[PDB]
Amino acid sequence: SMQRASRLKRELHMLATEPPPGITCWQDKDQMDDLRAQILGGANTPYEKGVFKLEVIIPERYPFEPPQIRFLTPIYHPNIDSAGRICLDVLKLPPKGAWRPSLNIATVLTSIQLLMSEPNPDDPLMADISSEFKYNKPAFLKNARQWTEKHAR
Ligand SMILES: Nc1nc2cc(F)ccc2o1
C-alpha cells in the first residue's frame, strides 16, 4: 500500500535523524518493514551498560496493526519472556491493547524502554520474576544485572 510506504519512509527518516535518547532503529536490509532496533540499558536500572537488540516487524496492515517487536538479546524482566516476547499495551490492538495509528515505531520503542525501567507486575509474562521483583527486589536487581552482564554486554 502506498499509504503504508509513505508512512514508513517518514518514520525511518525520523528514526534516523531524531531517534529517542538511548534508542536506535534501522533497516536490516532494503525492506522498510524488516527493521532492527537497539535500546541502551538505562542508568540506575539493572540493565545499565547493556545493549539490547530487538526485531521490529511491520505488518502488512500497519499503521492499523501494531509493530511486532521482540527482544533478540536475552533480558531478565517480569514482562518479557524467554523468547523475547513483550507484554505491553501499546503493542496490542484494542479493546485490551493501546495501539492506535497515531502512535509509531519511535513511540512504542520508547514505551519498551520505559517498561525496562518500570516493570508491570500487574501483567506478568514471567511469574517467578514478577514475584521476585515484587517481594525480593534486591534479588531481582542482582539477577537482572547478572543476566545483563552475561547476555547484553
Ligand atoms: N503476550 C501478551 N501480551 C499482552 C499485552 C497485554 F496488555 C496484556 C496481556 C498480554 O499477553
Q: Please state the domain extents for the chain.
A: 2-151
What CATH number should be reported for the domain whose range is 2-151?
3.10.110.10
Atom 4, ligand 1: residue with shortest CA distance: 87
Kindly report the number of other CB atoms within 10 A of residue 106's CB atom.
17
The alpha-carbon radius of gyration of the chain (Å, integer) is 16
CA of 144 to the centre of ligand 1 (A): 21
Q: What is the DSSP string of the chain?
A: -HHHHHHHHHHHHHHHHSPPTTEEEEESSS-TTEEEEEEEPPTTSTTTT-EEEEEEE--TTTTSS--EEEESS---BTTB-TT--B--GGGS-TTTS---TTS-HHHHHHHHHHHHHS--TTS-S-HHHHHHHHH-HHHHHHHHHHHHHHH--
Catalytic residue numbers read: 87
Task: Give the strand order in the sheet containing 34-40.
Answer: 23-27, 34-40, 51-57, 68-71
Structural contact between residues 27 and 12, judged by C-beta atoms closer than 8 angstroms: yes
Q: Which method, experimentally, gave rise to this model?
A: X-ray
